[PDB]
Ligand binder design. Structure first.
Ligand code: OGY
Ligand code: CL
Length: 300
């Protein structure tokens, strides 16, 4: 069985490169971040523009939702993160402490913590309520490309241009495991047993966290320059989804590693993809020659 993702909506509005798209956990919204210093909120199902959220002084590299879909966090070149009330569009907290661009961010499942990764080579853990930095992890020896909490928030996985993926005990900040090309993206599988890692040699790899071994390798896409998001699609067939520097969305069969679909339409690097939490829907977003978000729907 292969998916049949077809274009449903093109979301225009950003005036520079889109950096990240994420579906709200309740499935209602897509959030987009951009080099244009803005967050935009869109209807997940009708693609309808809802609102612009502004306040960062420089471009945004990443955005992430709280578990209840009420808050966003953004990571910016202004060296801050901002926590946003999505309903009001208001900045609740500015998280200050990184000494260079903040590149990546995520809430834990409880959504009492935010993890961030920075060009300053550190991973920070922040208290959402106070906006204060709880821990600074001397995580890497080059810019941090991705940070992600596992299913219960007990672990953080980080990746870096230093070629390392590290797994951190959230509660203590201690490194549990180091899992040489630059690692441009990492995240835990929904069940937290696997880590998906991108390297800037046109390769995605599925790792068994507990055993520390590579189970699957996905190739055929172009990825030598940008930190391109990748996803587990789990609503229908079990796919791996990624953007690509050849302007396509790549979908692989997770088990067989065969490319099952390439989605055409973007006119620049597909930097970010997201999979809808309940429906067979993909969001894709592209760099500055395109600047659009596309919503795609499949029957499986
Ligand atoms: O965790 C992987 C990750 C986070 N953010 C990105 C996108 C980087 C590209 C980009 C940056 C700033 C403006 C426009 C585009 N990848
Ligand atoms: Cl996620």
């Amino acid at each position: 069985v292969k998916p049949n993702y077809a274009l449903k909506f093109t979301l225009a509005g950003h005036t520079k490169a889109v950096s990240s798209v994420k579906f709200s956990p309740n499935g209602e919204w897509l959030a987009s971040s951009s080099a244009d210093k803005l967050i935009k909120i869109w209807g997940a199902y009708d693609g309808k523009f809802e609102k612009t959220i502004s306040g960062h002084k420089l471009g945004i590299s990443d955005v992430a939702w709280s578990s209840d879909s009420n808050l966003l966090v953004s990571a910016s070149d202004d060296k801050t993160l901002k926590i946003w009330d999505v309903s009001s569009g208001k900045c609740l907290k500015t998280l200050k402490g990184h000494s260079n661009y903040v590149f990546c961010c995520n809430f834990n499942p409880q959504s009492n913590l935010i993890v961030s990764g920075s060009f300053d080579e550190s991973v920070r853990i922040w208290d959402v309520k106070t906006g204060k930095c709880l821990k600074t992890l001397p995580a890497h020896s080059d810019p941090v490309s991705a940070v992600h909490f596992n299913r219960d928030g007990s672990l953080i996985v980080s990746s870096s241009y230093d070629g390392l993926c590290r797994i951190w005990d959230t509660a203590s900040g201690q490194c549990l495991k180091t899992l040489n090309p630059p690692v441009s993206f990492v995240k835990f599988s929904p069940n937290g047993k696997y880590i998906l890692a991108a390297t800037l040699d046109n390769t995605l790899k599925l790792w068994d966290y507990s055993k520390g071994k590579c189970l699957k390798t996905y190739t055929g896409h172009k990825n030598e320059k940008y930190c391109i998001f990748a996803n587990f699609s789990v609503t229908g067939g079990k796919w791996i989804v990624s953007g690509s520097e050849d302007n396509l969305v790549y979908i692989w069969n997770l088990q067989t590693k065969e490319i099952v679909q390439k989605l055409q339409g973007h006119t620049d690097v597909v930097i970010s993809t997201a999979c809808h939490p309940t429906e067979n829907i993909i969001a894709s977003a592209a760099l500055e020659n395109d600047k659009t978000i596309k919503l795609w729907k499949s029957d499986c």
